[PDB]
Design an enzyme around this catalytic site. Structure first.
Site, PDB file in Angstrom:
ATOM      1  N   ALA A  32      -2.908  -3.650   8.827  1.00  0.00           N
ATOM      2  CA  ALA A  32      -1.951  -4.690   8.483  1.00  0.00           C
ATOM      3  C   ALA A  32      -1.975  -4.958   6.985  1.00  0.00           C
ATOM      4  CB  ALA A  32      -2.238  -5.990   9.237  1.00  0.00           C
ATOM      5  N   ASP A  33      -0.964  -5.695   6.540  1.00  0.00           N
ATOM      6  CA  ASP A  33      -0.834  -6.191   5.178  1.00  0.00           C
ATOM      7  C   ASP A  33      -0.667  -7.709   5.212  1.00  0.00           C
ATOM      8  OD1 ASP A  33       2.042  -4.511   5.803  1.00  0.00           O
ATOM      9  OD2 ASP A  33       2.189  -6.673   5.425  1.00  0.00           O
ATOM     10  N   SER A  34      -0.639  -8.326   4.028  1.00  0.00           N
ATOM     11  CA  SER A  34      -0.658  -9.784   3.972  1.00  0.00           C
ATOM     12  C   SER A  34       0.626 -10.438   4.480  1.00  0.00           C
ATOM     13  CB  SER A  34      -0.967 -10.245   2.541  1.00  0.00           C
ATOM     14  OG  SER A  34      -0.223  -9.517   1.584  1.00  0.00           O
TER      15      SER A  34
ATOM     16  N   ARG C  39       9.359  -7.287   2.421  1.00  0.00           N
ATOM     17  CA  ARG C  39       8.732  -6.003   2.718  1.00  0.00           C
ATOM     18  C   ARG C  39       9.295  -4.894   1.839  1.00  0.00           C
ATOM     19  NH1 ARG C  39       5.988  -2.103   4.944  1.00  0.00           N
ATOM     20  NH2 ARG C  39       4.197  -3.532   5.024  1.00  0.00           N
ATOM     21  N   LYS C  42       7.847  -5.156  -1.740  1.00  0.00           N
ATOM     22  CA  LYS C  42       6.413  -5.417  -1.674  1.00  0.00           C
ATOM     23  C   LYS C  42       5.662  -4.756  -2.827  1.00  0.00           C
ATOM     24  CE  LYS C  42       3.483  -3.925   1.723  1.00  0.00           C
ATOM     25  NZ  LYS C  42       2.608  -4.259   2.851  1.00  0.00           N
TER      26      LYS C  42
END
Ligand SMILES: *P(=O)(O)OCC(C)(C)[C@@H](O)C(=O)NCCC(=O)NCCSC(=O)CCCCCCCCCCC
Ligand SMILES: *Cc1c(COP(=O)(O)O)cnc(C)c1O
Lengths: 71, 291, 75
Positions: A32-34, C39, C42
């Site tokens: 996952a990412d933030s 996203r 990002k």
């Protein structure tokens, strides 16, 4: 289950129920990412209607930290 | 054929809905917003009540201004109902008006067009986009023909602004009609673009300008979004029934307008704010129609 | 500049606020728009760019807040 937290996190990070362990870190085990973080901690109250604060949430990197915080 | 109001545009007009100078500045901002969307100068944008008024100014405007030299106007048989009503009026006033048919592809035949031009043509008026089946008209090529022939070129972009890119000088537009509530703005507002040589309530004009800015910023994202949902709709019906066909030249479809045929035809509309649940509903409610 | 936890709190804030839209289409468009926007941007690496997109983000959060509050004024 009663502590059916692996369903919400599995549904948020797109991982089967076999990969979601208890010592699984969201970033390096569930990949996952933030942004996935805030989405998942936001989705937990969709099941429990809680309010985990900004300050006391940065260290809930494990799944068992989630089940323990809910409990 | 209207659209819902975008909360951002409502946010723009609300300061002007609550108190009635700043009017000139708000209107100038709005008209450079419109101009920036279509590639015009701000001096070339005039606000109207909507695309109906814009079309009447353009068509009856040029028609009556040049009556003493030119008597022929060219349009298409599938224009908006008020364009056709206006042209019927011009006919009753003495003008001759050619109503071009569009082929099965939904596009007009350029050879038919330039063959139709007479020594007394002043105006060609062609929809930017076929609202019925979902093709783009060859606006740029038509502007070329009209430029070579010294004809005023007007186009109705009410259904095209914000969905496909437009630039007035590339397409050699002389006049263009724009509608506010066709692009998630408010009803009661419109614009006409008039090319230059070298009245309307201001909350509505700032609404139109805001809608135009939002469209210019949202064009690509909405393009591939509406495209994604269109592919979901078409492919989902095609899976449950392989007999249906999508009308119109596939090389010239634009996002938002899908016409399918059964074995009669039905038309679907997908836009900004359309969800996957709606596409997933009308795919089955239409499939339930087992004639 | 505007760090990283700043834009994370920002994104959390637009998700939270956008979830309070009374209309369904406005709320799903809001959260899908925000998710896709953050996203996609990002891995942007330009500061003069980044602070521009968070400026726009703040403005938009402004409008979202104003109209969810107005929507709650009538309930
Ligand atoms: P994670 O990896 O820890 O995340 C931290 C990141 C990587 C994001 C951070 O460190 C980073 O590098 N950021 C680079 C740039 C950035 O993050 N910019 C943020 C701003 S993005 C933006 O402009 C959002 C726009 C949202 C518009 C939504 C419109 C809603 C419409 C409402 C009306 C209905
Ligand atoms: C809706 C529409 C019009 C009318 O626009 P209004 O602002 O309602 O007057 C004109 N032409 C086309 C192609 C339209 O779709």
């Amino acid at each position: 289950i009663e502590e059916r937290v692996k369903k919400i996190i599995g549904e948020q990070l797109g991982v089967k129920q076999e990969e979601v362990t208890n010592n699984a870190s969201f970033v390096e085990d569930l990949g996952a990412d933030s942004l996935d973080t805030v989405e998942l901690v936001m989705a937990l109250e969709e099941e429990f209607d809680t309010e985990i604060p900004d300050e006391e949430a940065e260290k809930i990197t494990t799944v068992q930290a989630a089940i323990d915080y809910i409990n | 054929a209207t659209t819902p109001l975008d909360p951002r545009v409502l946010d723009a007009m609300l300061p002007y809905l609550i108190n009635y100078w700043e009017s000139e500045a708000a209107m100038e901002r709005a008209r450079q917003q419109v101009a920036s969307l279509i590639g015009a100068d701000p001096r070339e944008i005039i606000f109207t009540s909507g695309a109906t008024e814009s079309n009447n100014i353009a068509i009856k405007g040029v028609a009556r201004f040049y009556r003493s030299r030119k008597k022929h106007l060219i349009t298409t048989q599938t224009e908006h109902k008020c364009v056709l009503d206006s042209c019927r009026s011009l006919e009753a006033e003495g003008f001759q008006v050619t109503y071009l048919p569009v082929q099965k592809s939904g596009i007009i035949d350029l050879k038919e067009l330039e063959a139709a031009i007479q020594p007394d043509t002043s105006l060609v008026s062609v929809m930017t986009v076929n609202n019925e089946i979902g093709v783009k008209q060859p606006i740029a090529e038509i502007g070329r023909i009209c430029s070579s022939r010294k004809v005023y070129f007007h186009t109705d972009a009410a259904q095209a602004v914000g969905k496909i890119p437009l630039d007035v000088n590339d397409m050699k537009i002389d006049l263009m009609s724009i509608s506010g509530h066709k692009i998630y703005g408010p009803k009661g507002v419109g614009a006409i673009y008039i090319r230059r040589r070298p009245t309307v309530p201001t909350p509505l004009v700032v609404g139109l300008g805001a809608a135009c800015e939002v469209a210019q910023q949202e064009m690509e994202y909405d393009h591939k979004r509406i495209s994604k949902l269109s592919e979901r709709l078409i492919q989902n019906i095609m899976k449950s029934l392989p007999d249906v066909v999508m009308n119109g030249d596939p090389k010239h479809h634009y996002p938002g307008c899908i016409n399918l045929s059964f074995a009669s035809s039905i038309r679907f509309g997908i836009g900004r704010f359309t969800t996957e649940e709606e596409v997933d509903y009308t795919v089955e409610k239409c499939i339930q129609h087992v004639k | 500049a505007s760090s990283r936890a700043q834009v994370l709190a920002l994104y959390r804030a637009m998700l939270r606020e956008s979830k309070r839209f009374s209309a369904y289409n406005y709320r799903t468009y809001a959260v899908r728009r925000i998710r896709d926007a953050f996203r996609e941007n990002k891995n942007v690496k330009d500061p003069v760019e980044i602070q521009t997109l968070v400026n726009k983000a703040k403005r938009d959060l402004g409008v979202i807040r104003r109209q969810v509050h107005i929507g709650q004024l009538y309930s």
